Amino acid sequence: ATASSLNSVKDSLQRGQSTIDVALAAGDTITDLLTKMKEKALAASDTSLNTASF
């Protein structure tokens, strides 16, 4: 009964792996988005820009 019962534990562990996979797949986008954020913030830090570019 215990050895048969372990199968749901296995399925839960790999369902959790799938959920963490989806989370990391979104974080790969969030990181690039923050990188473009910091790049545009560096570009907007300049006082030399005319107002339209800012």
Next chain:
Amino acid sequence: ATASSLNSVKDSLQRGQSTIDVALAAGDTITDLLTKMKEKALAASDTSLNTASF
């Protein structure tokens, strides 16, 4: 992230170099104008000229 962020620094230094280039292009005119100014003043300093030349 720190590597990709430097493109904005490159664009900023390049924009500043272009602005200093435009300022020097104006100064090349400004200095020749000051030189012709000093020549006209040295010509006007002399008393021998009649009123029309002054």
